[PDB]
Design a protein around this ligand. Structure first.
Ligand SMILES: Cc1cc2n[nH]c(=O)n2c2ccccc12
Length: 279
């Protein structure tokens, strides 16, 4: 038993909002860095059950494109969740306003996003709030899906549950959440992935929300792709976006078909530069 190995110094606030905050923690002995999510359960009446569910869902997860859950500790009314530290920060901060990022970089992030979402959906979990703020990067820019506070089970014992809870973030949310009482979970996550791809390639969000009252959304359904953000996006990825951002969730492209898409499969991005010399 090595003394002090269970001691962590909190050295930097990584993020902070409703739940509480996430701190960078550094091990006193080993100097290993992890993220610690600190949740004061007295802050809200529903917080005890909310954080319980988040912990429950996290214990189900193990994938290279999902933020790793190391465990949790309660002391009185404070919950401490130990999570993978992602030193590259949020994907949000790699999207340049009005520009986006190089298309090969966006393609790589999108491959990894799909890997993460396929995994989650495979074990019957929907995230329900996919957006660049909730996609973190490690030291090699590998993407990790973050924050399972709004996540839920949509498939259990091989039987699908239809959802009805209005949740997410309006510019990322699928139109069926605003129009229908019930909806399938998976196309909702597919839609938000499409808005994420749009942001990565154009540095802007296409609409405030996907309703006919929103002129920008109306323009998209009328195929006015000579307007922004769409005019900034090359034809191959735009063709994929035309298949994802389809109003009818039943006609919307599925992830197995996204994986067969021409742009998805285009060679664009070189592997990370590795040390070399010449003679
Ligand atoms: C910036 C950042 C790094 C991180 N690594 N692991 C995590 O949970 N986070 C975060 C969680 C919330 C907000 C920011 C972060």
């Amino acid at each position: 038993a090595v003394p002090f190995v269970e001691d962590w110094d909190l050295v930097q606030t990584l993020g902070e909002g409703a739940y509480g905050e996430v701190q960078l923690a550094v091990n006193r002995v080993t100097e290993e860095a992890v993220a610690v999510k600190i949740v004061d359960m007295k802050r809200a009446v529903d917080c005890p059950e909310n954080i319980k569910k988040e912990i429950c869902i996290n214990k189900m997860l193990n994938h290279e494109n999902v933020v790793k859950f190391y465990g949790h500790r309660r002391e009185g009314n404070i919950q401490y969740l130990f999570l993978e530290y992602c030193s590259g920060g949020e994907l949000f901060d790699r999207i340049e306003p009005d520009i986006g990022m190089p298309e090969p970089d966006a393609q790589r992030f999108f491959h990894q996003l799909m890997a993460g979402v396929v995994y989650l959906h495979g074990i019957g979990i929907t995230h329900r709030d996919i957006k660049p703020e909730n996609l973190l990067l490690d030291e090699r820019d590998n993407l990790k899906i973050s924050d399972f506070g709004l996540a839920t089970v949509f498939r259990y014992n091989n039987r699908e549950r239809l959802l009805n809870k209005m949740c997410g973030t309006l510019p990322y949310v699928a139109p069926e959440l605003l129009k229908r009482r019930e909806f399938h979970a998976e196309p909702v996550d597919v839609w938000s992935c499409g808005i994420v791809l749009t942001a990565m390639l154009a540095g802007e969000l296409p609409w405030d929300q996907p309703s006919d009252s929103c002129q920008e959304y109306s323009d998209w359904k009328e195929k006015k792709t000579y307007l922004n953000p769409w005019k900034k996006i090359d034809s191959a990825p735009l063709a994929l976006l035309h298949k994802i951002l389809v109003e009818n969730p039943s006609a919307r492209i599925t992830i197995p078909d996204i994986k067969k898409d021409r742009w998805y499969n285009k060679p664009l991005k070189k592997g990370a530069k590795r040390p070399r010399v010449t003679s």
